[PDB]
Amino acid sequence: GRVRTKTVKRASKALIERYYPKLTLDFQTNKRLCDEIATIQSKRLRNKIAGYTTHLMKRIQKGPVRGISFKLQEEERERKDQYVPEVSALDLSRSNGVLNVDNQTSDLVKSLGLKLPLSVINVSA
Amino acid sequence: SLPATFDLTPEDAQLLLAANTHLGARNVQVHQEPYVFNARPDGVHVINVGKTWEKLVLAARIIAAIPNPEDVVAISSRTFGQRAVLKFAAHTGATPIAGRFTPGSFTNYITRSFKEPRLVIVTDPRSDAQAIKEASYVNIPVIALTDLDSPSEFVDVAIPCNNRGKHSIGLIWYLLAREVLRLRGALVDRTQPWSIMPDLYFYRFP
Amino acid sequence: TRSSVLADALNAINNAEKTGKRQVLIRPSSKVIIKFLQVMQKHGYIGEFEYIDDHRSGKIVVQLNGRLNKCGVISPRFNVKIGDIEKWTANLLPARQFGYVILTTSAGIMDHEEARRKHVSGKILGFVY
Amino acid sequence: GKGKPRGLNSARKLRVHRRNNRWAENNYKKRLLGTAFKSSPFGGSSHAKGIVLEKLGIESKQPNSAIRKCVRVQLIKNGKKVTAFVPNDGCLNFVD
Amino acid sequence: GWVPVTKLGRLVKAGKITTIEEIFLHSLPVKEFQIIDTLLPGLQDEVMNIKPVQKQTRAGQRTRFKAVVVVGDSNGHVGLGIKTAKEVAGAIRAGIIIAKLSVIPIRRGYWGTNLGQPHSLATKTTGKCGSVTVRLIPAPRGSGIVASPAVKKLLQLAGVEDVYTQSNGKTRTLENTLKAAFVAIGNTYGFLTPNLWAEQPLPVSPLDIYSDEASAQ
Amino acid sequence: MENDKGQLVELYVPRKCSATNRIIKADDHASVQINVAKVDEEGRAIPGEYVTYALSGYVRSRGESDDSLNRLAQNDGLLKNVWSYSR
RNA sequence: GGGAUCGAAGAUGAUCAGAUACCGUCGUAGUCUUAACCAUAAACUAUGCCGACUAGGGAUCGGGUGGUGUUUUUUUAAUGACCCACUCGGCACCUUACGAGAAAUCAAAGUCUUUGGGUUCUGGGGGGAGUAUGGUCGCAAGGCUGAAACUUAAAGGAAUUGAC
């Protein structure tokens, strides 16, 4: 069971989250990348990190794996303000300017003493 | 202690009739039969929307009574109320708690979820029941948006609406939001309709 | 069957005060009940109230303010003498400072301090504080 | 109303109820039947004299194992045979 | 230096509240014992009981200690706190703290006349906890405290000078007895008398007069 | 409560409730104090001037504080046509 | 009188393991009625009876009042049967707790130290003991009533944890 230690996972994951496009599918160039871009004191643990960058780069070029990319939270902030329909369902133009409503609710509005466009569609049980 | 400026608007009444806020629950509790207008023959009761309006007016008065606008907290575990509460608190200055309520948020002075409100506003007192029970320990008033079979334990001023239809919920939060802002002074004229549509407070899904 | 009526009346008054209400409906009524409630109303443990006729025996609607802690009856109406008052006011009242054990003397029904002042005695109905 | 009568002309039922329920005590029943005057070996007195008939090595086993030093006496006033403990003398050297 | 975390606490630290009578007036929940310590400087505690209790915690037979502690002013501010802890002195200290939190006032009054200071209670009161019921009756001046020495000590830490007591139930279990006596002395500010029938206007809190202060930044 | 010198001898006067007029005690945390803002002619709230209410933990816990506060508001002219005295 | 089933006793074949005792087949009394006797149960809802007050909710059972309800259309009706709304009077349910209790729990086991609506019966640590004796009822079996001597520091009720 070759479970990668926490330092290799976190370092390789960070080097792909921040520094994605420099990294490649090849171990021998990502190894030189990990030589040049992080201060890893030992060649062996650098090879661990570099081959795990290679494996995760093989995984991410198939689909977006759950890393860090701060380009979508602002789009979700925009998504709150995107779908503002210009005609609401509360707007009378959806129902030809009239409120289709029952006899008792019309009796309520008559008791209010307020004049609104109302069409009395009766219901029963 | 109210001018006739505060009275019910024909535009707002058209809005409230369009949102089916008048369509009350099937069964009605003991303490909310004052809010019932009548029962339709299909078993749906009718909510006195004028009473509803003046309850929103008094609730807006109470929200105006808190000096610092941060101690006002809106609450929703209701799905549509999440949208409504977030956009409400955006336009208001209050703080929202959408989704799941963390217990011990009003007790437990140590944790990071520790907030000190001076007012709690609730979409559904049945879905947000634990927030009512939590507010019942640290002396916080509770404003609720009660349908006609909503439980009225530990509640202050309660607004009769329909918590089923999302248009009703978004519009109730909408009207309370605009009336609070008109009472503050950022909406100086009363003749002015609130320019943001009630569709910003309604809930969407792709 | 229904044996005492002032007992049932104070039962209903005390229950509605425990729930915090504002009014009660007593059925039936009596002269004794009216005099008792006048004694209450004189010191003002209650506000105003009202008789209702139905030709049988009246009903009473009482407005009760907030001031009643507890009222009750002493159901065997004991014969009491003058110093005996100092026993019952040592038993039933919450302090020497207030509270009214009420007596039924031959000069009417009233609280114990008036019967100190009028220097009479009689039987005992109940206690109010 | 608490399962007992409270009428103002009901003193009789109350005192008959007390005289029936005081026979359930212990001291009352010993006291008004003359129990001590009939069967207790002293006959209802604080002391008594008697004549030693035997010295007894009674045994107390559990949980305390001890050899109790006792004396079988026949009392003078009654003709009653009573065993009794004698303290502080391991030898019983003051007793024959 | 103590930093608060509650807006009541940073009001108390700001010197904007003087007595606890505001907190007692406004029914506030206290969660900082430093407030009680800064507002009751003459608050004198006393231990009532320390007892070793044998726990069985995850295959471990261990010894913890139950400490029943009463704090109390020589005026009318009492507090009760019960704490189990692994150490004796930690149980003492945290029981002191829990008693600092549960401080309630008392309404000590008169018996008979109106001279000098109130010495006895003002009415009869009653507390219950478990099967222990404790009944407090006012007493004449200079009559001492007719109570069992635990209850007597909890009353001496109140400035109650004269009271008759009667109990009922199994008063062997002393924590039920101290809780029942504590409920009895808490209920004295709970019985409405004719000299407090006078209608009073509702005053404002310190939470809104001092709302611009004491806010979390 | 006062002494024979006529000076008051109490720690604090308790707040009473308004729905049931009973005493709100020093540890009723289920009770509630309500501020309702005084309005202007324009419909702006006066910042430091409120009308206050007291609704005790028994009142609020029983499920009555809504109806009772409606009664208190309409009797103080903050509502209209809501609380009916006859039912 | 009846006697089909099953079946206290009895008469019997047993056996194989310490898998417990065995079991199995026949079977009188009885079980079913008539004329009488007896009067006991965990005869429990382990909760006396009468009466008032105090929260909701939705199902049912019996009765009744309404509906420009519904259906069976007989032409309209009227029956009935359901649905809706109300009202009594039940047997039960389900929440809570305001209140009670030691707790389980209780809309009464609530309105009880802030102790009183009326009234009947019962109990006073455990055994000895529902035993002895006497009275009474009964053909009998038994029932009702009912001790003391002596002996003893617990016997208990509810809830809680984990170690063979």
PDB file of N, CA and C in Angstrom, chain A residues 77-92 99 101-102 104-105 107-109 111-112 114-118 122-125, chain B residues 8-10 13-15 17-19 22-23 37-42 46-50 83 86-87 167 171 197-200 202 204-206:
ATOM      1  N   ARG A  77     -21.502  34.944  -7.276  1.00  0.00           N
ATOM      2  CA  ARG A  77     -21.982  36.241  -6.805  1.00  0.00           C
ATOM      3  C   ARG A  77     -22.769  36.964  -7.893  1.00  0.00           C
ATOM      4  N   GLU A  78     -22.332  36.829  -9.147  1.00  0.00           N
ATOM      5  CA  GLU A  78     -23.071  37.402 -10.268  1.00  0.00           C
ATOM      6  C   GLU A  78     -24.383  36.663 -10.509  1.00  0.00           C
ATOM      7  N   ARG A  79     -24.389  35.345 -10.265  1.00  0.00           N
ATOM      8  CA  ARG A  79     -25.551  34.490 -10.511  1.00  0.00           C
ATOM      9  C   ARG A  79     -26.752  34.893  -9.661  1.00  0.00           C
ATOM     10  N   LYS A  80     -26.498  35.506  -8.502  1.00  0.00           N
ATOM     11  CA  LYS A  80     -27.568  36.079  -7.693  1.00  0.00           C
ATOM     12  C   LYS A  80     -28.293  37.200  -8.431  1.00  0.00           C
ATOM     13  N   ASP A  81     -27.562  37.992  -9.209  1.00  0.00           N
ATOM     14  CA  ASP A  81     -28.133  39.150  -9.882  1.00  0.00           C
ATOM     15  C   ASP A  81     -28.405  38.917 -11.362  1.00  0.00           C
ATOM     16  N   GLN A  82     -28.081  37.732 -11.893  1.00  0.00           N
ATOM     17  CA  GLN A  82     -28.307  37.467 -13.314  1.00  0.00           C
ATOM     18  C   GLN A  82     -29.790  37.335 -13.636  1.00  0.00           C
ATOM     19  N   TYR A  83     -30.454  36.326 -13.071  1.00  0.00           N
ATOM     20  CA  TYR A  83     -31.841  36.032 -13.435  1.00  0.00           C
ATOM     21  C   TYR A  83     -32.776  36.942 -12.645  1.00  0.00           C
ATOM     22  N   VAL A  84     -32.864  38.184 -13.104  1.00  0.00           N
ATOM     23  CA  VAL A  84     -33.899  39.105 -12.652  1.00  0.00           C
ATOM     24  C   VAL A  84     -34.850  39.279 -13.830  1.00  0.00           C
ATOM     25  N   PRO A  85     -35.949  38.523 -13.891  1.00  0.00           N
ATOM     26  CA  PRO A  85     -36.881  38.660 -15.016  1.00  0.00           C
ATOM     27  C   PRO A  85     -37.570  40.016 -15.017  1.00  0.00           C
ATOM     28  N   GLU A  86     -37.713  40.581 -16.215  1.00  0.00           N
ATOM     29  CA  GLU A  86     -38.230  41.936 -16.355  1.00  0.00           C
ATOM     30  C   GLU A  86     -39.735  42.004 -16.146  1.00  0.00           C
ATOM     31  N   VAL A  87     -40.448  40.904 -16.369  1.00  0.00           N
ATOM     32  CA  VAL A  87     -41.866  40.796 -16.050  1.00  0.00           C
ATOM     33  C   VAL A  87     -42.010  39.723 -14.984  1.00  0.00           C
ATOM     34  N   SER A  88     -42.469  40.116 -13.801  1.00  0.00           N
ATOM     35  CA  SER A  88     -42.643  39.142 -12.740  1.00  0.00           C
ATOM     36  C   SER A  88     -43.941  38.372 -12.941  1.00  0.00           C
ATOM     37  N   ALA A  89     -44.102  37.312 -12.149  1.00  0.00           N
ATOM     38  CA  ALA A  89     -45.396  36.658 -12.043  1.00  0.00           C
ATOM     39  C   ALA A  89     -46.382  37.488 -11.237  1.00  0.00           C
ATOM     40  N   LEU A  90     -45.884  38.456 -10.466  1.00  0.00           N
ATOM     41  CA  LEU A  90     -46.727  39.419  -9.779  1.00  0.00           C
ATOM     42  C   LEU A  90     -47.237  40.504 -10.715  1.00  0.00           C
ATOM     43  N   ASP A  91     -46.591  40.680 -11.868  1.00  0.00           N
ATOM     44  CA  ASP A  91     -46.996  41.685 -12.839  1.00  0.00           C
ATOM     45  C   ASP A  91     -48.258  41.236 -13.560  1.00  0.00           C
ATOM     46  N   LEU A  92     -49.194  42.172 -13.732  1.00  0.00           N
ATOM     47  CA  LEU A  92     -50.530  41.845 -14.216  1.00  0.00           C
ATOM     48  C   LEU A  92     -50.550  41.449 -15.685  1.00  0.00           C
ATOM     49  N   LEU A  99     -56.467  40.253 -12.084  1.00  0.00           N
ATOM     50  CA  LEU A  99     -56.199  39.261 -11.049  1.00  0.00           C
ATOM     51  C   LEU A  99     -57.336  38.249 -11.058  1.00  0.00           C
ATOM     52  N   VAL A 101     -59.194  35.652  -9.373  1.00  0.00           N
ATOM     53  CA  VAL A 101     -59.261  35.374  -7.944  1.00  0.00           C
ATOM     54  C   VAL A 101     -60.696  34.990  -7.589  1.00  0.00           C
ATOM     55  N   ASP A 102     -60.872  34.410  -6.404  1.00  0.00           N
ATOM     56  CA  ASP A 102     -62.124  33.778  -6.018  1.00  0.00           C
ATOM     57  C   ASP A 102     -63.121  34.794  -5.475  1.00  0.00           C
ATOM     58  N   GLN A 104     -64.593  34.816  -2.406  1.00  0.00           N
ATOM     59  CA  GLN A 104     -64.334  35.244  -1.036  1.00  0.00           C
ATOM     60  C   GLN A 104     -63.162  36.213  -0.960  1.00  0.00           C
ATOM     61  N   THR A 105     -62.155  36.034  -1.815  1.00  0.00           N
ATOM     62  CA  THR A 105     -61.039  36.970  -1.814  1.00  0.00           C
ATOM     63  C   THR A 105     -61.468  38.311  -2.401  1.00  0.00           C
ATOM     64  N   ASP A 107     -64.481  39.378  -1.900  1.00  0.00           N
ATOM     65  CA  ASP A 107     -65.198  39.911  -0.746  1.00  0.00           C
ATOM     66  C   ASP A 107     -64.232  40.545   0.253  1.00  0.00           C
ATOM     67  N   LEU A 108     -63.051  39.941   0.414  1.00  0.00           N
ATOM     68  CA  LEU A 108     -61.978  40.525   1.219  1.00  0.00           C
ATOM     69  C   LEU A 108     -61.545  41.886   0.687  1.00  0.00           C
ATOM     70  N   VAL A 109     -61.332  41.984  -0.627  1.00  0.00           N
ATOM     71  CA  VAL A 109     -60.886  43.240  -1.230  1.00  0.00           C
ATOM     72  C   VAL A 109     -61.979  44.299  -1.138  1.00  0.00           C
ATOM     73  N   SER A 111     -64.145  44.403   1.302  1.00  0.00           N
ATOM     74  CA  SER A 111     -64.099  44.813   2.702  1.00  0.00           C
ATOM     75  C   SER A 111     -62.936  45.757   2.973  1.00  0.00           C
ATOM     76  N   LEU A 112     -61.843  45.622   2.219  1.00  0.00           N
ATOM     77  CA  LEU A 112     -60.744  46.574   2.329  1.00  0.00           C
ATOM     78  C   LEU A 112     -61.139  47.952   1.816  1.00  0.00           C
ATOM     79  N   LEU A 114     -60.712  48.929  -1.417  1.00  0.00           N
ATOM     80  CA  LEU A 114     -59.643  49.305  -2.329  1.00  0.00           C
ATOM     81  C   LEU A 114     -59.960  48.727  -3.701  1.00  0.00           C
ATOM     82  N   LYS A 115     -59.863  49.561  -4.735  1.00  0.00           N
ATOM     83  CA  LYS A 115     -60.328  49.203  -6.072  1.00  0.00           C
ATOM     84  C   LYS A 115     -59.170  48.631  -6.881  1.00  0.00           C
ATOM     85  N   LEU A 116     -59.294  47.370  -7.271  1.00  0.00           N
ATOM     86  CA  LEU A 116     -58.299  46.655  -8.052  1.00  0.00           C
ATOM     87  C   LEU A 116     -58.982  45.964  -9.221  1.00  0.00           C
ATOM     88  N   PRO A 117     -58.249  45.698 -10.313  1.00  0.00           N
ATOM     89  CA  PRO A 117     -58.796  44.839 -11.374  1.00  0.00           C
ATOM     90  C   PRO A 117     -58.889  43.381 -10.946  1.00  0.00           C
ATOM     91  N   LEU A 118     -60.112  42.863 -10.842  1.00  0.00           N
ATOM     92  CA  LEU A 118     -60.367  41.521 -10.337  1.00  0.00           C
ATOM     93  C   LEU A 118     -61.344  40.796 -11.250  1.00  0.00           C
ATOM     94  N   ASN A 122     -65.319  31.477  -9.762  1.00  0.00           N
ATOM     95  CA  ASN A 122     -65.880  30.800  -8.601  1.00  0.00           C
ATOM     96  C   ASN A 122     -65.309  29.389  -8.485  1.00  0.00           C
ATOM     97  N   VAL A 123     -65.090  28.942  -7.248  1.00  0.00           N
ATOM     98  CA  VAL A 123     -64.753  27.557  -6.954  1.00  0.00           C
ATOM     99  C   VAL A 123     -65.847  26.978  -6.062  1.00  0.00           C
ATOM    100  N   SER A 124     -65.816  25.656  -5.910  1.00  0.00           N
ATOM    101  CA  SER A 124     -66.812  24.949  -5.108  1.00  0.00           C
ATOM    102  C   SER A 124     -66.221  23.621  -4.669  1.00  0.00           C
ATOM    103  N   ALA A 125     -65.990  23.481  -3.362  1.00  0.00           N
ATOM    104  CA  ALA A 125     -65.490  22.263  -2.713  1.00  0.00           C
ATOM    105  C   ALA A 125     -64.174  21.757  -3.301  1.00  0.00           C
TER     106      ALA A 125
ATOM    107  N   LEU B   8     -52.730  50.973   3.129  1.00  0.00           N
ATOM    108  CA  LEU B   8     -52.543  49.969   2.089  1.00  0.00           C
ATOM    109  C   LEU B   8     -52.720  50.584   0.706  1.00  0.00           C
ATOM    110  N   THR B   9     -51.717  50.406  -0.151  1.00  0.00           N
ATOM    111  CA  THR B   9     -51.450  50.785  -1.533  1.00  0.00           C
ATOM    112  C   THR B   9     -52.147  49.816  -2.487  1.00  0.00           C
ATOM    113  N   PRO B  10     -52.809  50.333  -3.532  1.00  0.00           N
ATOM    114  CA  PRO B  10     -53.408  49.435  -4.533  1.00  0.00           C
ATOM    115  C   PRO B  10     -52.396  48.574  -5.262  1.00  0.00           C
ATOM    116  N   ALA B  13     -51.426  45.827  -2.943  1.00  0.00           N
ATOM    117  CA  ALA B  13     -52.530  44.884  -2.806  1.00  0.00           C
ATOM    118  C   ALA B  13     -52.640  43.976  -4.024  1.00  0.00           C
ATOM    119  N   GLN B  14     -52.384  44.518  -5.222  1.00  0.00           N
ATOM    120  CA  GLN B  14     -52.307  43.686  -6.423  1.00  0.00           C
ATOM    121  C   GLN B  14     -51.179  42.672  -6.322  1.00  0.00           C
ATOM    122  N   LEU B  15     -50.030  43.107  -5.794  1.00  0.00           N
ATOM    123  CA  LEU B  15     -48.902  42.204  -5.573  1.00  0.00           C
ATOM    124  C   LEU B  15     -49.281  41.065  -4.635  1.00  0.00           C
ATOM    125  N   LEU B  17     -52.245  39.925  -3.811  1.00  0.00           N
ATOM    126  CA  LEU B  17     -53.212  39.002  -4.391  1.00  0.00           C
ATOM    127  C   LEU B  17     -52.580  38.117  -5.450  1.00  0.00           C
ATOM    128  N   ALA B  18     -51.585  38.632  -6.173  1.00  0.00           N
ATOM    129  CA  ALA B  18     -50.937  37.824  -7.199  1.00  0.00           C
ATOM    130  C   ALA B  18     -50.090  36.710  -6.594  1.00  0.00           C
ATOM    131  N   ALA B  19     -49.515  36.937  -5.414  1.00  0.00           N
ATOM    132  CA  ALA B  19     -48.605  35.981  -4.797  1.00  0.00           C
ATOM    133  C   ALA B  19     -49.308  34.870  -4.035  1.00  0.00           C
ATOM    134  N   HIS B  22     -53.023  35.485   0.306  1.00  0.00           N
ATOM    135  CA  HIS B  22     -54.322  35.380   0.947  1.00  0.00           C
ATOM    136  C   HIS B  22     -54.738  33.933   1.155  1.00  0.00           C
ATOM    137  N   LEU B  23     -54.243  33.015   0.327  1.00  0.00           N
ATOM    138  CA  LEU B  23     -54.618  31.606   0.433  1.00  0.00           C
ATOM    139  C   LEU B  23     -53.993  31.021   1.688  1.00  0.00           C
ATOM    140  N   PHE B  37     -59.920  35.597   7.168  1.00  0.00           N
ATOM    141  CA  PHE B  37     -61.089  36.293   6.635  1.00  0.00           C
ATOM    142  C   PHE B  37     -62.279  35.345   6.539  1.00  0.00           C
ATOM    143  N   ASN B  38     -62.163  34.319   5.699  1.00  0.00           N
ATOM    144  CA  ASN B  38     -63.198  33.311   5.514  1.00  0.00           C
ATOM    145  C   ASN B  38     -62.560  32.033   5.008  1.00  0.00           C
ATOM    146  N   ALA B  39     -63.358  30.972   5.006  1.00  0.00           N
ATOM    147  CA  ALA B  39     -62.959  29.670   4.496  1.00  0.00           C
ATOM    148  C   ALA B  39     -63.655  29.441   3.167  1.00  0.00           C
ATOM    149  N   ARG B  40     -62.868  29.210   2.122  1.00  0.00           N
ATOM    150  CA  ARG B  40     -63.431  28.847   0.838  1.00  0.00           C
ATOM    151  C   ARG B  40     -64.037  27.445   0.937  1.00  0.00           C
ATOM    152  N   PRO B  41     -64.979  27.090   0.049  1.00  0.00           N
ATOM    153  CA  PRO B  41     -65.581  25.747   0.134  1.00  0.00           C
ATOM    154  C   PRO B  41     -64.623  24.595  -0.119  1.00  0.00           C
ATOM    155  N   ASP B  42     -63.466  24.830  -0.731  1.00  0.00           N
ATOM    156  CA  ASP B  42     -62.495  23.755  -0.885  1.00  0.00           C
ATOM    157  C   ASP B  42     -61.648  23.519   0.361  1.00  0.00           C
ATOM    158  N   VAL B  46     -58.905  32.175   4.032  1.00  0.00           N
ATOM    159  CA  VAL B  46     -58.501  33.416   3.397  1.00  0.00           C
ATOM    160  C   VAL B  46     -57.902  34.315   4.463  1.00  0.00           C
ATOM    161  N   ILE B  47     -56.737  34.852   4.172  1.00  0.00           N
ATOM    162  CA  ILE B  47     -56.021  35.696   5.112  1.00  0.00           C
ATOM    163  C   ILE B  47     -56.388  37.147   4.848  1.00  0.00           C
ATOM    164  N   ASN B  48     -56.758  37.865   5.907  1.00  0.00           N
ATOM    165  CA  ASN B  48     -57.010  39.302   5.847  1.00  0.00           C
ATOM    166  C   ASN B  48     -55.715  40.010   5.510  1.00  0.00           C
ATOM    167  N   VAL B  49     -55.560  40.378   4.239  1.00  0.00           N
ATOM    168  CA  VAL B  49     -54.300  40.951   3.796  1.00  0.00           C
ATOM    169  C   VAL B  49     -54.119  42.381   4.285  1.00  0.00           C
ATOM    170  N   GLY B  50     -55.193  43.054   4.701  1.00  0.00           N
ATOM    171  CA  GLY B  50     -55.031  44.350   5.343  1.00  0.00           C
ATOM    172  C   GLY B  50     -54.426  44.225   6.727  1.00  0.00           C
ATOM    173  N   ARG B  83     -32.796  32.349  -0.333  1.00  0.00           N
ATOM    174  CA  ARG B  83     -32.719  33.427  -1.314  1.00  0.00           C
ATOM    175  C   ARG B  83     -33.291  34.729  -0.773  1.00  0.00           C
ATOM    176  N   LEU B  86     -31.169  36.180   2.155  1.00  0.00           N
ATOM    177  CA  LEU B  86     -29.883  36.697   1.696  1.00  0.00           C
ATOM    178  C   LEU B  86     -30.036  38.032   0.987  1.00  0.00           C
ATOM    179  N   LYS B  87     -31.015  38.138   0.090  1.00  0.00           N
ATOM    180  CA  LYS B  87     -31.199  39.405  -0.608  1.00  0.00           C
ATOM    181  C   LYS B  87     -31.801  40.472   0.304  1.00  0.00           C
ATOM    182  N   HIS B 167     -43.531  32.684  -4.121  1.00  0.00           N
ATOM    183  CA  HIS B 167     -43.848  34.066  -4.451  1.00  0.00           C
ATOM    184  C   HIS B 167     -44.314  34.820  -3.221  1.00  0.00           C
ATOM    185  N   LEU B 171     -42.184  37.841  -1.649  1.00  0.00           N
ATOM    186  CA  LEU B 171     -42.864  39.126  -1.633  1.00  0.00           C
ATOM    187  C   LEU B 171     -43.027  39.660  -0.216  1.00  0.00           C
ATOM    188  N   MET B 197     -36.993  44.868  -8.338  1.00  0.00           N
ATOM    189  CA  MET B 197     -38.180  44.050  -8.516  1.00  0.00           C
ATOM    190  C   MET B 197     -38.270  42.973  -7.435  1.00  0.00           C
ATOM    191  N   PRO B 198     -39.482  42.486  -7.138  1.00  0.00           N
ATOM    192  CA  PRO B 198     -39.614  41.318  -6.249  1.00  0.00           C
ATOM    193  C   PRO B 198     -39.062  40.014  -6.816  1.00  0.00           C
ATOM    194  N   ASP B 199     -38.634  39.980  -8.080  1.00  0.00           N
ATOM    195  CA  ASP B 199     -37.985  38.796  -8.627  1.00  0.00           C
ATOM    196  C   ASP B 199     -36.579  38.577  -8.092  1.00  0.00           C
ATOM    197  N   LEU B 200     -35.942  39.593  -7.509  1.00  0.00           N
ATOM    198  CA  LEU B 200     -34.633  39.361  -6.916  1.00  0.00           C
ATOM    199  C   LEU B 200     -34.739  38.543  -5.637  1.00  0.00           C
ATOM    200  N   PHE B 202     -37.112  36.163  -5.160  1.00  0.00           N
ATOM    201  CA  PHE B 202     -37.697  34.860  -5.451  1.00  0.00           C
ATOM    202  C   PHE B 202     -36.601  33.845  -5.747  1.00  0.00           C
ATOM    203  N   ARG B 204     -34.685  30.592  -7.450  1.00  0.00           N
ATOM    204  CA  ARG B 204     -34.424  30.104  -8.793  1.00  0.00           C
ATOM    205  C   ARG B 204     -33.670  28.783  -8.718  1.00  0.00           C
ATOM    206  N   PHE B 205     -33.665  28.060  -9.838  1.00  0.00           N
ATOM    207  CA  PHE B 205     -32.786  26.915  -9.998  1.00  0.00           C
ATOM    208  C   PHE B 205     -32.528  26.737 -11.487  1.00  0.00           C
ATOM    209  N   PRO B 206     -31.284  26.440 -11.892  1.00  0.00           N
ATOM    210  CA  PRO B 206     -31.009  26.163 -13.305  1.00  0.00           C
ATOM    211  C   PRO B 206     -31.561  24.810 -13.746  1.00  0.00           C
TER     212      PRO B 206
END
